[PDB]
Amino acid sequence: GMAKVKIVGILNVTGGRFVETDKAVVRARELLSQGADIIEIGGESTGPGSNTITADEELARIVPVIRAIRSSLPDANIAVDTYKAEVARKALELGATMINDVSAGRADPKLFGVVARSNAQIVLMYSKDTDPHTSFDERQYVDVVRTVYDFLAERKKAAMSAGIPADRIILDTGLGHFVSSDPQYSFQLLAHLSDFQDLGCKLFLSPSRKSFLAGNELLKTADRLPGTIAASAIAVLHGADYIRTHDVLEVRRGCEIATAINQPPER
Amino acid sequence: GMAKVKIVGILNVTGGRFVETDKAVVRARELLSQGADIIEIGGESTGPGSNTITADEELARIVPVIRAIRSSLPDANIAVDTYKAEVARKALELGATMINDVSAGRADPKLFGVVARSNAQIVLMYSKDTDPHTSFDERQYVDVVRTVYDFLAERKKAAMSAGIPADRIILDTGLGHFVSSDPQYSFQLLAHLSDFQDLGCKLFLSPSRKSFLAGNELLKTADRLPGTIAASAIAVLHGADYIRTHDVLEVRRGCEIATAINQPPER
Ligand SMILES: Nc1nc2ncc(CO)nc2c(=O)[nH]1
Ligand SMILES: Nc1nc2ncc(CO)nc2c(=O)[nH]1
Ligand SMILES: [Cl-]
Numbered sequence: 001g002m003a004k005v006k007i008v009g010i011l012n013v014t015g016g017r018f019v020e021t022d023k024a025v026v027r028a029r030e031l032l033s034q035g036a037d038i039i040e041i042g043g044e045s046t047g048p049g050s051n052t053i054t055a056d057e058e059l060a061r062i063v064p065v066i067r068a069i070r071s072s073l074p075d076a077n078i079a080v081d082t083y084k085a086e087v088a089r090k091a092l093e094l095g096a097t098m099i100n101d102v103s104a105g106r107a108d109p110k111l112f113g114v115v116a117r118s119n120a121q122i123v124l125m126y127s128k129d130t131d132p133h134t135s136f137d138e139r140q141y142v143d144v145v146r147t148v149y150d151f152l153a154e155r156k157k158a159a160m161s162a163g164i165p166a167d168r169i170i171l172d173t174g175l176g177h178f179v180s181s182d183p184q185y186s187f188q189l190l191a192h193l194s195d196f197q198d199l200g201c202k203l204f205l206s207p208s209r210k211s212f213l214a215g216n217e218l219l220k221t222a223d224r225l226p227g228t229i230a231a232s233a234i235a236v237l238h239g240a241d242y243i244r245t246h247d248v249l250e251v252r253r254g255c256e257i258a259t260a261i262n263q264p265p266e267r
Numbered sequence: 268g269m270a271k272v273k274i275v276g277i278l279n280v281t282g283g284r285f286v287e288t289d290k291a292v293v294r295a296r297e298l299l300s301q302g303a304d305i306i307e308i309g310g311e312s313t314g315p316g317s318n319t320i321t322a323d324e325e326l327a328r329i330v331p332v333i334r335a336i337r338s339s340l341p342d343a344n345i346a347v348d349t350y351k352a353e354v355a356r357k358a359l360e361l362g363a364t365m366i367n368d369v370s371a372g373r374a375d376p377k378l379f380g381v382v383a384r385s386n387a388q389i390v391l392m393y394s395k396d397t398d399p400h401t402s403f404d405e406r407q408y409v410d411v412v413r414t415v416y417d418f419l420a421e422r423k424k425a426a427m428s429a430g431i432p433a434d435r436i437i438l439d440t441g442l443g444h445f446v447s448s449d450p451q452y453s454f455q456l457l458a459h460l461s462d463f464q465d466l467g468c469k470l471f472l473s474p475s476r477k478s479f480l481a482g483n484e485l486l487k488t489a490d491r492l493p494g495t496i497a498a499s500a501i502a503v504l505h506g507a508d509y510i511r512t513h514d515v516l517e518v519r520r521g522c523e524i525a526t527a528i529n530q531p532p533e534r
């Protein structure tokens with residue numbers, strides 16, 4: 001029996017900041033209602049055009065939300081999106097069990113150790129830039145699969161050297177602008193995702209209505225749900241163990257079909 | 268450059284039968300608007316519980332609709348779903364360029380010759396039953412891929428013997444109840460669809476909200492669009508050249524993503 005994918009539901013937190021906390025719990029409950037396995041909280045955007053926020057601002061955004069979710073939804077599994085060691089440290093103390101670092105441990109030399117001194121998992125994503133805030137850039141590649149594979153191999157090596165065992169390391173190839181503002185490279189990584197299973201780590205991907213799904217029609221975000229379903233399903237077909245998404249209900253259901261296709265006949 | 272899938276939009280025609288014809292043209296135009304490449308007309312259901320209709324009743328349903336579409340939408344490519352030679356013959360005379368036979372040429376010994384004496388393509392579908400009206404039956408298989416492959420090999424041989432060249436033969440493994448009321452076999456055929464490319468024919472499949480997509484939640488038809496998108500996308504990933512669907516807009520868009528994943532890098 002092949003296990004289904006774990007669905008990671010996005011809960012972004014980016015005078016009146018207390019109005020967000022009650023609404024965050026309502027949103028988290030809806031994500032769980034739709035079948036999310038993990039609620040992913042983040043207080044700092046890192047897409048193109050984003051700017052750096054301080055650790056104090058980042059904590060001020062996510063800590064009230066973590067506390068409220070831990071109190072009202074106590075069995076909910078929490079992940080926190082951060083590249084800052086101080087933020088990861090507080091998140092882990094409050095009960096988060098996953099840290100997702102879009103810098104793959106590069107932005108803060110202390111973050112690996114913080115996670116090493118926990119029982120949390122870390123997600124290491126490939127990005128074409130050193131700055132966790134990714135750029136608009138039509139980066140080309142001779143062989144994006146080789147580039148990303150070797151990058152993730154090296155980041156896994158670094159995470160293990162800092163004390164994180166392989167079984168708490170999750171790898172993400174990146175998709176969309178993190179890989180390139182040219183969409184072809186995201187499709188190539190999805191095509192060859194099974195090659196990354198040789199690194200011995202669970203795989204996490206996030207098609208999530210990214211602009212590489214705009215296609216020939218130049219589809220805006222509201223029109224990218226069919227493409228997000230198709231990409232997330234093929235990612236699972238090709239070895240994804242986690243899918244991060246805003247559309248938990250539909251992507252869970254589409255991924256269940258991928259799992260069923262991967263299921264070998266009766267033995 | 269890998270070609271995109273051809274989307275086959277379903278237009279079913281199953282006191283006041285003249286009210287259907289004007290509405291059929293409106294529906295056909297919408298299917299084309301959404302990006303269908305072929306409009307598939309049929310006057311006889313063949314799912315579980317369906318009953319046989321006469322050739323005269325079948326023609327009385329589809330001929331006014333074909334004529335109206337040929338007149339109002341003259342560049343639209345028309346396929347007709349029929350297992351009857353007489354019906355196929357009239358459809359071809361009126362300008363249909365595809366005959367889809369859910370009996371794979373078994374139900375009417377004259378149908379192969381009718382298509383041979385045309386420039387139309389024929390779709391040969393596998394079904395577990397000889398009767399084109401398929402049964403409710405949880406048919407089990409030792410190796411459904413072997414069964415279906417050998418069946419389609421033999422039907423291709425028969426079609427060629429009757430005068431239809433390979434390049435006008437399209438093969439469909441069947442899905443849903445045509446294969447089995449047990450869903451596992453539909454998923455297995457999707458998993459192994461590329462094995463059928465050895466038969467040297469274009470491949471046609473129709474996930475189209477069939478009950479094998481009901482999943483663990485026992486989803487009704489209204490809730491099967493994410494699963495239809497995922498299944499149709501993986502079918503294209505695995506070699507489908509045609510996808511037959513009611514949800515042309517969404518399935519076209521999901522399949523475009525599958526095509527992009529199949530697209531090799533710059534050479
Ligand atoms: N691991 C991971 N994290 C992300 N965080 C933000 C965004 C924003 O688009 N994408 C991703 C992603 O693709 N993978
Ligand atoms: N070739 C083909 N024809 C069909 N006709 C009707 C239906 C009705 O569900 N399905 C199919 C199908 O899966 N393939
Ligand atoms: Cl610590």
Ligand SMILES: [Cl-]
Nearest residue numbers: 356380381384
């Ligand atoms: Cl004839």
